[PDB]
Amino acid sequence: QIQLVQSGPELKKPGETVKISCKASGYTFTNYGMNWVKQAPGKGLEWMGWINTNTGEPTYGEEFKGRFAFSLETSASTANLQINNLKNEDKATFFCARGEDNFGSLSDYWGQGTTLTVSSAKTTAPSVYPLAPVCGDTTGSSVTLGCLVKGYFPEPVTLTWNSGSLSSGVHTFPAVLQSDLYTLSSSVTVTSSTWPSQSITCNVAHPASSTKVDKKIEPRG
Amino acid sequence: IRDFNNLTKGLCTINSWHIYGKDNAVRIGEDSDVLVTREPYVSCDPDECRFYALSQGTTIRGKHSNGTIHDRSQYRALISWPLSSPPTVYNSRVECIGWSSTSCHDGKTRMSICISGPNNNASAVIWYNRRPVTEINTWARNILRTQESECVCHNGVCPVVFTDGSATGPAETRIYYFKEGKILKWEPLAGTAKHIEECSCYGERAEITCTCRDNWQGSNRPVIRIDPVAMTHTSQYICSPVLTDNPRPDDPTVGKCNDPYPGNNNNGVKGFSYLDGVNTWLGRTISIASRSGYEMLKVPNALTDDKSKPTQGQTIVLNTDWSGYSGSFMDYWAEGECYRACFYVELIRGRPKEDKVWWTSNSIVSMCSSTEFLGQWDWPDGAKIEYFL
Ligand SMILES: *[C@@H]1O[C@H](CO)[C@@H](O[C@@H]2O[C@H](CO)[C@@H](O[C@@H]3O[C@H](CO)[C@@H](O)[C@H](O[C@H]4O[C@H](CO)[C@@H](O)[C@H](O)[C@@H]4O[C@H]4O[C@H](CO)[C@@H](O)[C@H](O)[C@@H]4O[C@H]4O[C@H](CO)[C@@H](O)[C@H](O)[C@@H]4O)[C@@H]3O)[C@H](O)[C@H]2NC(C)=O)[C@H](O)[C@H]1NC(C)=O
Ligand SMILES: *[C@@H]1O[C@H](CO)[C@@H](O[C@@H]2O[C@H](CO)[C@@H](O)[C@H](O)[C@H]2NC(C)=O)[C@H](O)[C@H]1NC(C)=O
Ligand SMILES: *[C@@H]1O[C@H](CO)[C@@H](O)[C@H](O)[C@H]1NC(C)=O
Ligand SMILES: [Ca+2]
């Protein structure tokens, strides 16, 4: 129905330039305008301005008049935020949303967001480490096994305990940055009947470094 | 004419819309002595059609345009001027003094009613042949209001709908029947409607239809049909799921004929409709939350069938453009088999949405109906709020 899928997350060293694309479907592009919003982590949601997909004319908000530039590939129904000279406080997530009415007071149907990690840091690819237990019956007739995905940059990382299949009783924890890199981990609990019996495998993909790992949590005990 | 008018025809087949009138008032008013108006409309004499509208007593550019978002004051006045010229200081005729009007011509001459006053002690004065004849002082004492577009007369008799009371709840709406300025009778609003404001009215086959505004609970519009001859009326709602008021809840699958449709209380926008069986066309803003865009929809039988969804449409003002108030009018003296249906769309520029400036004026767009299928265009007010800074 309306779906606005956006570009994937972007890493860019300070002072650089980025064009974040947003492709519309469901509606007639020209009769609804694009609203762009900044959800910066420790602060909240900010309107950036709005563009008229019929005339092409952008409005900008005060805090955005200057490096932000709205542009549109009408012909493919795409709005793009271009940010120039990436001052570090542009580390945030940018949502494009369809402005219902004229000027975009009502944003109904939002896009999934794109995350700009403005950073001097280098891409480091991860260390996927199978954590089999020192046995320890983790609750009656259950065992919890783990997967430490250390030392990578930038975020994200896709983690699936066996190709999407161990779905219930998984806890992937948020990643945390230790100055230059992140450390992420997941747990999964299974009944004793299932492990070491079947093959639980950590299927970790670092898409920035073209890295896909499958560490089998082998019984080691 | 030199004889009363009788609505002897029916509406013509409404198949598309052709532009009839364009003002460009705000665009030209950035460098001409133009008046700040709002609540515009169009009425025809036997002789000519004219744009009518409530002046604010200042030019867009003059420093007294500041704070013209306020609706009523002693500087407002019903004024009138040539079809499609701007409402200029030098070509406006003052019809009477007040902040609510209605004006119509009965075949012989015209009736204009301007309402004035403080909200708790207001009075209506009914001008006929440019002289005050009758006056009606308030009845419920909290803002006596009326049509905001032309009224319709049959054989001397003109029903005019007035509301006095609260816009948030039950108010005293009475239908007055005038003939030549004197009150012939008045009855109170009767029927299933729940609140009445700003009725847009047109007339055919000896009967008068008024699409009004439900300010208390309605998102579907209430309709008054007045027999001008017998001096009676009734009121029901527009059954159609195609909700036309604004702001509105999103349109349902099935709607409500004898009651207000729930969702947006204490709000509306004056609006109109052409109710003629298959040849019914409705108009709403395109936005559900705001007065942006304006579009026309053919919704066969929308008055009576409560699952009527639109079969043909026409975009009038683009959703990336502002609209405002709409109302019906026809040139009852034009030559032919039938009534060419027409309407207008106020184009509100200014405060509150475009508050970079402190004035609120508006422009006007008019269209009449074609039996043809003419292709469509959008019609923007057109000014750039940035050249007034
Ligand atoms: C040359 O000009 C001609 C003549 O103008 C052009 O042909 C005309 O072109 C029109 C556009 O193609 C066409 O109108 C459409 O007609 C269909 C019926 O076939 C009608 O349903 C359409 O109206 C709906 O869609 C428009 C947007 O396109 C909406 O703005 C409108 O509100 C209608 O949809 C909403 O209300 C419906 C009724 O409830 C709902 O079913 C629908 O879900 C939708 O609701 C949502 O939005 C509402 C507000 O926007 C909201 O309140 C609600 O809650 C929902 O959320 C449209 O009018 C004419 O019929 C066609 N005429 C002819 C003779 O061809 C031609 O293309 C031009 N040629 C060139 C080359 O440009
Ligand atoms: C007339 O317009 C002016 C600016 O054109 C308005 O100015 C503001 O007035 C309030 C006090 O009522 C001040 O707090 C603002 O800081 C003023 N701003 C400026 C730019 O001076 C003024 O309010 C308007 N109304 C009247 C009645 O003068
Ligand atoms: C107008 O209508 C009335 C009632 O229908 C009729 O008796 C009268 O003669 C008509 N006059 C004109 C000018 O049409
Ligand atoms: Ca309402």
CATH number at residue A148: 2.60.40.10
Is B289 an 8 Å CB contact of chain A? Answer: yes
B320 and A100 in contact by Cβ < 8 A? no
Indicate yes or no: CB of A102 within 8 angstroms of CB of B289: no
Residue B267 annotated as binding site? yes
Question: Which is catalytic among the residues B33, B45, B71, B259?
Answer: B71
Among the partner-chain residues B287, B318, B321, the one whose CB lies closest to the CB of A100 is B287
What does the alpha-carbon distance between residue B232 and residue B218 come to, in Å, rounded to a whole number?
A: 24
Tokens of A44: 């909240």
Chain A CA closest to residue B289: A101
Is B197 annotated as contributing to ligand binding? yes
In this structure, are A56 and A104 located in the same domain?
yes
Do A125 and A64 reside in the same domain of the chain?
no
d(CA B202, CA A167): 65
Same domain assignment for residues A173 and A189 = yes
Residues with Cβ within 8 Å of A74's Cβ and at least 6 positions away in sequence, in order, are: A29, A30, A53, A56
* Residues A1 and A76 placed together within one structural domain of the fold: yes
- From CA B63, how far away is CA B328, in angstroms rounded? 34
In A66-135, DSSP assigns E strands to 68-73, 78-84, 92-99, 107-110, 114-118, 127-131
B325 is catalytic: yes
d(CA B109, CA B178): 13
Q: How far apart are CA A207 and CA A125, in angstroms?
A: 9
Residues A148 and A57 in one domain: no
Strand order in the sheet with A211-216: A158-161, A201-206, A211-216
What is the CA angle B61-B43-B50, rounded to 5? 45
List the resolution, Å: 2.5
Tell me which chain A residue has its CA closest to the CA of residue B320: A102
Contact yes or no for B35/B89 (Cβ under 8 A): yes
Residues A2 and A90 in one domain: yes
Cβ neighbours of A59 in B, within 8 Å: none
The total number of structural domains that make up chain A: 2
Shortest Cα–Cα distance, A117 to chain B (Å): 33
Structure token pair of residue B116: 């004035």
Which domains are present in chain B?
A: 1-389 (2.120.10.10)
Residues of B in contact with A100 (CB under 8 A): 287-290
CB–CB of A214/A202 below 8 Å? yes
Centre of ligand 2 to C-alpha B352, Å, is: 15
Which residue from B224, B201, B188, B220 is spatially nearest to B328, judged by alpha carbons?
B201
Residue A148 sits in the same domain as residue A161: yes
Q: Does B348 touch chain A (CB under 8 A)?
A: no
Q: Is the CB of B67 under 6 A from ligand 2?
A: yes
Q: Does residue B252 have a cis bond before it (omega within 30 degrees)?
A: no
Measured between alpha carbons, how far is B302 from B164 in angstroms, rounded to an integer?
29
What SS3 class is residue B27? helix
The answer to whether B108 faces chain A, any CB pair under 8 Å, is no
φ/ψ of B127, rounded to 5, equals -85, 135
- What is the amino acid identity at position B219? S
Q: Are residues A71 and A101 in the same domain?
A: yes
**Count of A–B CB contacts within 8 Å?**
39
Are A163 and A95 members of one domain?
no
In chain B, DSSP finds a helix count (H) and a strand count (E) of: 1, 24
Domain end, chosen from A86, A120, A154, is at A120
The verdict on whether residue B218 carries a ligand-binding annotation is yes
d(CA B69, CA B55): 12
- Rounded (10°) CA dihedral B314, B316, B317, B318: 30
Q: Is B38 annotated as a binding residue?
A: yes
Ligand nearest to the CA of B288: 1
Residue with CA at minimum distance from ligand 3 atom 7: B155
Q: For residue B310, give both structure tokens.
A: 């639109």
Quick one: A109 and A128 in the same domain?
no
> How far apart, in whole angstroms, are the C-alpha atoms of residue A156 and residue A177?
12
Backbone φ and ψ for A129, nearest 5 degrees, come out as: -130, 120
- State the CB neighbour count (10 A cutoff) for residue B154: 23
Task: Copy the structure tokens of residue A166.
Answer: 């161990």
Question: From CA B319, how far away is CA A34, in angstroms rounded?
Answer: 13
Give the number of the ligand closest to the Cα of residue B242. Answer: 1
**Are A1 and A105 contained in the same domain?**
yes
Token couple for A45? 């949601």
Last residue of a domain, one of A120, A146, A178: A120
B contact test, residue of A28, A59, A65, A102 with most B CBs within 10 A:
A102
For residue B384, list chain A residues with Cβ-Cβ distance below 8 A: none
Cis bond upstream, residue B352 (ω within 30): yes
Residue nearest to atom 3 of ligand 3 (CA): B155
Q: Burial-class residue B119 by CB neighbours within 10 Å (0-12, 13-18, 19+).
A: exposed
Q: Which amino acid is at B157?
A: V
Q: How far apart are CA B44 and CA B346, in angstroms?
A: 18
Amino acid at B174: R
Report DSSP letters for A129-160, one per residue: EEE--SS---STTEEEEEEEEEEEBSS--EEE
Cβ within 8 Å, pair B353-A103: yes
SS3 B296: strand
> Does B353 contact chain A (CB < 8 Å)?
yes
Query: What does DSSP say about strands A10-12 and A114-118: parallel, antiparallel, or unpaired?
Result: parallel
Domain end: A90, A120, A150, which one? A120
**Beta-bridge partners for B217:** none
User: Which backbone phi and psi does B306 adopt, to 5 degrees?
Assistant: -90, 25
Cα-to-centroid distance, B240 and ligand 4 (Å)? 15
Alpha helices in chain B (DSSP H): 25-28
Neighbours of B339 (CB within 10 A): 23
Within an 8 Å CB–CB cutoff, is residue B385 touching chain A? Answer: no
| A101–B287 CB contact, under 8 Å | yes
Domain range for A179: 121-219
Confirm if A74 and A66 have CB atoms less than 8 A apart: no
Tell me the chain A residues in contact with residue B355 when contact means C-beta distances shorter than 8 Å.
none
Residue of A nearest to B286 (CA): A101
d(CA B244, CA B241) in angstroms, rounded, equals 9
CB atoms within 10 A of CB B353: 18
Counting every residue, how long is chain A? 221
Q: Which two tokens stand for residue B289?
A: 């939350």
Closest CA to B114 of B104, B129, B105, B124: B124
SS3 A59: strand
Residue from the list A33, A105, A106 with its beta carbon closest to the beta carbon of B320: A33
Report residue B173 as tokens.
Answer: 């709406």
Q: Residue B358 is which amino acid?
A: W
Residue B71 a catalytic site member? yes
Residue B205 labelled as part of a binding site: no
How many angstroms does the Cα of residue B369 sit away from the middle of ligand 1? 18
Whether residues A82 and A146 fall in one domain: no
CA neighbor of B320 nearest in space, from A103, A209, A17, A203: A103
Buried b (16+ CB within 10 A) or exposed e, A11-29: bbeeeeebebbbbbeebeb
Asked if A139 has any chain B CB less than 8 Å from its own CB, the reply is no
Contact B196, B245 (CB under 8 A): no
Give long-range contacts, CB 8 A cutoff, 24+ apart: B56-63: B56/B361, B59/B29, B59/B33, B59/B34, B59/B35, B59/B89, B60/B26, B60/B29, B60/B30, B60/B34, B60/B35, B60/B36, B60/B359, B60/B361, B60/B388, B61/B29, B61/B30, B61/B31, B61/B34, B61/B388
Cβ contacts of B289 on chain A, cutoff 8 Å: 100-101, 105-106
